[PDB]
Amino acid sequence: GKYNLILSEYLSFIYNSQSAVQIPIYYSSNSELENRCIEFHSKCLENSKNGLSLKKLFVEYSDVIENATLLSILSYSYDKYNAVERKLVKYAKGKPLEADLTVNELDYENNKITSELFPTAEEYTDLLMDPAILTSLSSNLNAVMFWLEKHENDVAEKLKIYKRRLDLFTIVASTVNKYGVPRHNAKYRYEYEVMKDKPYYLVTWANSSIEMLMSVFSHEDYLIARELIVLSYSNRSTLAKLVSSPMSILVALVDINGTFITNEELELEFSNKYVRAIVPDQTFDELKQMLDNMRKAGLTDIPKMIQDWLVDCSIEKFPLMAKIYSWSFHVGFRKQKMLDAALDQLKTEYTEDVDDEMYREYTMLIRDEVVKMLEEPVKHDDHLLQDSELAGLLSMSSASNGESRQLKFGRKTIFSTKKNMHVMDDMANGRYTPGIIPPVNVDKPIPLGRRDVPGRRTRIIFILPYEYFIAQHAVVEKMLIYAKHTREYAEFYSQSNQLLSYGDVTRFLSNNSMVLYTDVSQWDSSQHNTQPFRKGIIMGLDMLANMTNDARVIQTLNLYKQTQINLMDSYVQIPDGNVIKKIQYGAVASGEKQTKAANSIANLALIKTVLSRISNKYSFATKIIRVDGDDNYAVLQFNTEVTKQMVQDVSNDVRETYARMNTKVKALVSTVGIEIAKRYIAGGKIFFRAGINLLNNEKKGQSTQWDQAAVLYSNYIVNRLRGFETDREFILTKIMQMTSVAITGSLRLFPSERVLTTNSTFKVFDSEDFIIEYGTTDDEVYIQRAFMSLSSQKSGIADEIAASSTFKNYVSRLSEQLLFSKNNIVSRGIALTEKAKLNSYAPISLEKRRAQISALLTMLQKPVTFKSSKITINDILRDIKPFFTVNEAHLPIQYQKFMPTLPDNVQYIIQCIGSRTYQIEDDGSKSAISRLISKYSVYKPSIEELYKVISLHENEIQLYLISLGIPKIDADTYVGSKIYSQDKYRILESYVYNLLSINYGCYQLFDFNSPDLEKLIRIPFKGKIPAVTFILHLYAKLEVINHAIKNGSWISLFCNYPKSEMIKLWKKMWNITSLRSPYTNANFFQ
């Protein structure tokens, strides 16, 4: 209830003019008071439209100002161009910055003037420094200046922060004011005509530096930020890679005193085990060389901070390092050229000096692993393999973005990347031919996409036709299903919605064991992902072909085989300016349904093969192996205690044993710690990487101005929990400026806290971080009922595409390829279902969401709507609340810290109740209705749709499920069986969980199965209305948790809920009209 004041102050500061007037608009759920709000509105519009003073009416309608609820504030201020500079001149009295062209290796990667690299605009491209975000540099500068101005009179520790950040913004703005501000167009791009006479890499550097200096709360933060901002102005290729590299060695220096374990995918069972740190000497020499490079780059304070820690090597001073490890990834992306980014991968050293004893075993192990995956379904003749064509054709929506191709749906032209749409086009024109897999050769090389991530190399992405997906789909789904229960596939061991994300190293760490962990992300152009890898799979397919008797299955397997034949020789379109290069690359990368699990297989075979060579010199028992994409780790135990010399010799043997297969590696062996892309451990304590740029993005998405603010808030919350903390008021300023909308040149609207923080398709953030807010009031209920009426909108593009002839042909072909003779009873159902997977195409979503925002805006302008009784969540909570009673409690501390970097209140909760131990289905995947969909398809259907579908009669359930690819007999059996009644409750569980972010954010980290939380939640049991007692216990838990988060202290509860209200609510249960935005979720693991 504080945000709107900051909004008002932002408006007053940014505009400042006599002509700048400020126009609130209010609402109340009570008619008479609402008409007085309407009156105030009216009179304000008039007064605005007559240059009359507004300050007089504000007393007359005092009641509305005190008790009614605000919506938004309008603003009439003219163009008044270039006022940002006219304000900014004062904060730029420092010295500007000079580039240094002889730092980056390349020529165009220096921060020199555009004209020195692109004299003509016809060869200009802003894509090497495009922020790719619908928010301006000017927005950032205005926000910083507003923060600095309002915090210009404080006298505390805050002032010690303020002087520091003021100096940082001085350093930045001197450099900016030296030349000027680039001006955004309507699309938030930056054209040639502003950058023609200015440095090319000023924008990303500026934004990244603003984000960093806005995340300063301490002295070391100031040192680090000043030491990166001033060097990131020139160095743009060897900086985040530099400071983020030693961490991998540092984790091998922290003694464990106390540990965490994993059992099943979120279980913990702590251990007081102590483990020393047997680090060799030569890795210190390596580390010393790395610090010499660090100092050689122009870094002074942060080596000293890295140097004074080694005197003790303690874990209490260690979070600084972790903090440092996150300060490296908030400098921006290294958006270099497609060519030079491919050549990070396309350097090959293929040699007729590798072993042959190794590759044959490698090939065989891949073959054997494949056979273990596929023995059962290939043999028992599963339906999903026979009809693999139809399976992939349904599951196209869960695929990659194919190359743009010109379509026509009746009377339009489309350049879609979605392969389902490609299929729709090719069926009509006789071009659909899935059995004949295209070659990939000189006559038709392959396109590319670029998988980027800062501080590392650029990975490549295949962008293929739609036959490759269809071939790989069914076989890869059975392989993944097999890997759900296999432990060693770290990407895929789960229980249908989880990953082993807290690792499985710490079981067998001891004084006798060691662990070798290894980054394997560069192993795409390598000689072990070419020929042997493919041929092992070919061999497995031969065996599997002899392991079935049906012909459809053998054909499907032969098509998958033929796909691997074509992938063994594969060329690659790569432009460079005007001319086009094509390079032989017959190997593996991402952009495929198969790449992930198959790379995991190949790394597993590789490490199993290598690890049987250390056996020539050591006796050990392989206890555990894990492989997940861009990393892999294996633990191993000895007959004795570990020494430095065994570590050194093992490392040399591992390095040379990879060299025997012609494979480069920075081999890393340790005893207590690991480092990988997504996480790392020191001293039996899990830390995480907070490297998600907020004000700069990887590539250019498709979301609106609105939703990118929500994405940024989720990333903000995440990074805060990780450790990287930014000052929240700046973020709120960005959110309001990104939700601000221009109705004319001078009219602009700004919504309020009570529109943006309400559970709908328009939620963006919360008034108090780590806490969703609900509505006990009339007013939040009122607007939630209003916004649900408006969330449902239309897309004319989708309506006209579904009315053409080709779509109709596609629906007909789906039917007669699946079932026939109900052409007007189910086929229409299948069209309505195909509509559910046209929405992946982005412009449809933009049409629909822009329509939602405009419909929202035409009642943000004018007064409010009653919305006609449509029941939602706050209606229920309104009725649950008046039979509560709170009382002060006092819980003790009995749970262990294992995420130090958290804010102290969340940690206090974790340090008093447990951390989560299960993961209950956000999708309802284990639900008996969903185990059909995961059997005949991959398709999601959103929990809104399922929660709705179950509310209907037993007739249209059959239509809706058969329309999702499922056959008719099992649907009829499901309805006759009466299993939906055994699944109303699970679906509603998942629904309510999706509505309230229970599996999305901070609430993913908390134990609701605790005995300590439960004894506070004293709601007696009634029985035979399970939903009510369920929601009551859940909501009471949420009350206690929100009180804990927002105030630190604890409370109890009690609800002697009357049976009358139990029954009144039981009927309100399965008629809920509520919804939560996809863009608002904050997955802690990305």
Binding site: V579, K581, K582, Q584
Partner: peptide, 7 residues
């Protein structure tokens, strides 16, 4: 259209 060839 334009093409340049490597192996």
């Amino acid at each position: 259209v334009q093409y340049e060839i490597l192996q």
